[PDB]
Amino acid sequence: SETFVFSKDNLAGSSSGAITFGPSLSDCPAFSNGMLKAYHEYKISMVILEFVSEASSQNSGSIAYELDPHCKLNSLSSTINKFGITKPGKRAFTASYINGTEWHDVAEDQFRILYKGNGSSSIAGSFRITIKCQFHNPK
Amino acid sequence: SETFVFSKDNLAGSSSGAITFGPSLSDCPAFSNGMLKAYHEYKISMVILEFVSEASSQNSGSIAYELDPHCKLNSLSSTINKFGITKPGKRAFTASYINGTEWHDVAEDQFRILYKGNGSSSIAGSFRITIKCQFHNPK
Amino acid sequence: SETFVFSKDNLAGSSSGAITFGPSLSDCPAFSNGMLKAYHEYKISMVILEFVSEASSQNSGSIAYELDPHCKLNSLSSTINKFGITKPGKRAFTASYINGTEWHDVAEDQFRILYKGNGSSSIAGSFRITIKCQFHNPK
Amino acid sequence: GSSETFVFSKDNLAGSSSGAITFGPSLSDCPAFSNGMLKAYHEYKISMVILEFVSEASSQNSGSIAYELDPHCKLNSLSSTINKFGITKPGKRAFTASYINGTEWHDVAEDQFRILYKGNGSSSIAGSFRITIKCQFHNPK
Amino acid sequence: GSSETFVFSKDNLAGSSSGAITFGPSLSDCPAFSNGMLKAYHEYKISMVILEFVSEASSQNSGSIAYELDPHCKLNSLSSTINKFGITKPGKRAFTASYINGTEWHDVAEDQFRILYKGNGSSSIAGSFRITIKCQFHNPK
Amino acid sequence: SETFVFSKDNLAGSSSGAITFGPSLSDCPAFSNGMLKAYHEYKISMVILEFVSEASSQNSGSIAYELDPHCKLNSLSSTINKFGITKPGKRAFTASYINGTEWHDVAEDQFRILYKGNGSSSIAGSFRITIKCQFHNPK
Amino acid sequence: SETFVFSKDNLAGSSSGAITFGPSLSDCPAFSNGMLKAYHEYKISMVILEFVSEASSQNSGSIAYELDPHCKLNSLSSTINKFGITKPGKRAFTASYINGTEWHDVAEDQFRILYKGNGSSSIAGSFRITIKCQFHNPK
Amino acid sequence: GSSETFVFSKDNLAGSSSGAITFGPSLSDCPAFSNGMLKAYHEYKISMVILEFVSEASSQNSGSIAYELDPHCKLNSLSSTINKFGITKPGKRAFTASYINGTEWHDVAEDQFRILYKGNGSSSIAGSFRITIKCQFHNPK
């Protein structure tokens, strides 16, 4: 029942992107090219997403994050869940929310988080992702 | 968690078709055009399939139904389970039969019911479908 | 006992408008044209209104929201309940406050929330509305 | 208040004829209720309804009668066809208080609710609608 | 058959105003009976009548109200003045079956009997006529 | 929650009128011009209607009152309930009689009392009305 | 034991004034010209004073409020109790602090709150006053 | 302190005459209290008042007497007409401590409270106001 922590920094206020959890997570060199390449099954039981506000209080906007459990969206569609870029935020996703009740092959993504900001080009903050995951069937 | 009740009517004695429970369920606008556009995941925990016999007692035949759990069949193949078009029928499908153990994205069809009758062209009856289902991760 | 979540974004600091809950709620495509069109009775038991502060700290003003339980006001009259545009806010309305103790026909509005801001034209934040409602007498 | 039980019947429901039964001051099928107690009390509520279809049709007639319950009298004809009775088999259905907006006392000039019926069979006789309404009255005039 | 008890009141009986109360299809003072049960049953009979005068007049008003019982509806106004109530004192009178022709079932289009009242006092308010009719009904429509 | 006590005086033996409990209750400035301009909703849970007999014992007649729950009658129609103008009277109306089960906007008249007397033109008495009522959703 | 809520808005950062509770409270049309004019005794048991910060974070200053229980000050004297104009504040005054243990005639003030700001002329925020009061001896 | 009970009466209250009874140093109707104990004690409080109307008028006189309780002596005549007594029937009313500002000791030079009375009847005799005041005294002079 290991744990990983990584951070996507320098999130621009208007940058739109996707953080896919699986073989495509190049933002964490210790997960994509590490445990996955030497294992077969893995489930990401818990995802703690914490937005740390580096942005100046003079930046107007917000970062909306949409939690797609099947990687069937290439861009954000609903702007409901959002963090104000001026204040820190914390969010916890358990097993049921992120399709984390069954194993998956290390060649297939489990889920993704699509982030989209609508602020200025200045620095908006950082994303700290803590993934509590498990591995099975050692390779 | 909700209990959606809908129906398909004017099923002739020889009508052949498929009811795909998911985004293609145009029979019930309260499901395909409703909750499925307000959520990401859904699972159909129970399906109560009832056949109300509108047919005359002097008509012959029966309506067979196949419960395809993965929608790989586009037409009826097996006829082991059937309702006589002269007697009302009721059938219960729990989570295991209809792949309700796992959640699915609203762009994916969970399972389908292939229904085909062998009788004449007269009115055979109506299908009353009661899907007790849940939802998660609001859009 | 289903739940809906929707969001009215890009609330200008000086925009004045009304959010009516019922057939006129075009801000949520999954409620006005979804469940309501295929049901007869509905009561909105709980309304959680959360103001997320996207606005820069350089914006002076506030957004006053008035909860009219009979849709007899076309514009805000009392400026008591208000959110500072610089800080997040949360408010919970139970059954008694929003005339939510009896069913209503889907052709008639139940209540409305009139919002009025007195700040600058810049982005003031977003409104996140979580309506916990129930439906009865399937159509 | 006064508790009463009005049992009446709308007959000669052809398998193709459609209509609406409005409960309250427009209940022409039971003059004992529409023009009866409603002119002796200010407030009335229909706490319970028992709707029964007595099948007078023979086994050879194929069809059904679809009945829908409008609790606000804003529908003039049937729209959806979920609930239905077979024309060859007797049917029974019980509507409680919440289904028919019976939790609130109404002025006698208001129609509390209505039942819309529509047939999809032939033009012959299908059966009879036997309606039992258990009601309460308040504030005698 | 169905046994019912209809209690109603004709009010504002001035000490000088005279009139007639016809029991049956012309009982306008109690719409619960004239236009009520009479449209749900072919035959009705008024087994018992309790006629009471509630004296709302003060002791200073002098007079009386003379009431006569016509069991065949062939009288249009009071003729004799034997039975009477004092306007200052409450009065009670009980009419049994034979007095009001209540031994025979009548068609609902017929007036069973009537009570003619005539005052000989002043023009001020004298009291109220509270009428309780205990009746039976047969052959539901 | 409060217990407002007011009165209508100089009711002649033949005075005909209506007391509409709501914004049109000009008899008590503490109710129409007071709390009803500080709240949105109100319900009158109990009405104690007392008649104090100021009339001489040598005056005849009575005052009849009709408790219209929906204000559809603009004049007295029924006279089944009445107080003798020579004897003091008291009557109690609970929530069910006067439609107090539901709340109403302060621009709507809940119920009314139609009072009319048949006596002479002399002083008949006074109406003392005690409305035990509540309020909600302050303006 | 009724309750009132009112709000003094557009408090300038340098405005100095007094909020007197009684017949002189013209800021609340439902208290000065409502309940008081139709009653004799009244005591304001509790006063909840909440400062909502509408002011931009670029405004330097504070609003000092002094609670005079006998209306013997026409201007603020001590600057101890104060709210920062940049942040919300809440304060509760019980019966003993505001001379609220005995009734008073509706022609005499009970107490007053003297507010004085020393910031800029821009909008500094709003005052929300919730007075829980009681009335006696109906007029 | 000393507890006392002063029972007095203001008589010849015509059905049309109106006035005010101020309790304390201006209670001219009971010289035993206004000029009595108040000159022997610094502090007095009127803990309880029993106000009774003895009806000496005949049944023929129609009217009422409206009495209002001013607990701060800032009213000079009657304004509202909620509480009232019928002139033909004896009346009783009990004012406790809080109603008459009797929870605080007062200097003898202050009027604790007053009762304003106004009649709406004829000019004949209506009755008598019998007032019982139960009071306490402190700090003897």
UniProtKB/Swiss-Prot annotation, chains A, B, C, F, G:
Q: What is the lineage of its organism?
A: Viruses, Riboviria, Orthornavirae, Pisuviricota, Pisoniviricetes
Instruction: State where the protein is found.
Output: Virion; Host cell junction, Host plasmodesma; Host periplasm
**What domain of life does the native source organism fall in?**
Viruses
Q: Which residues cross the membrane?
A: none
Portion of the full sequence shown? 64 to 202 of 670
Role noted for this protein: Minor component of the viral capsid involved in aphid transmission and virus accumulation in the host. Required for the virus to move through the aphid. The RTD domain of the protein is exposed on the surface of the particle and determines the vector specificity and intestinal tropism in the aphid.
Its recorded name reads: Minor capsid readthrough protein
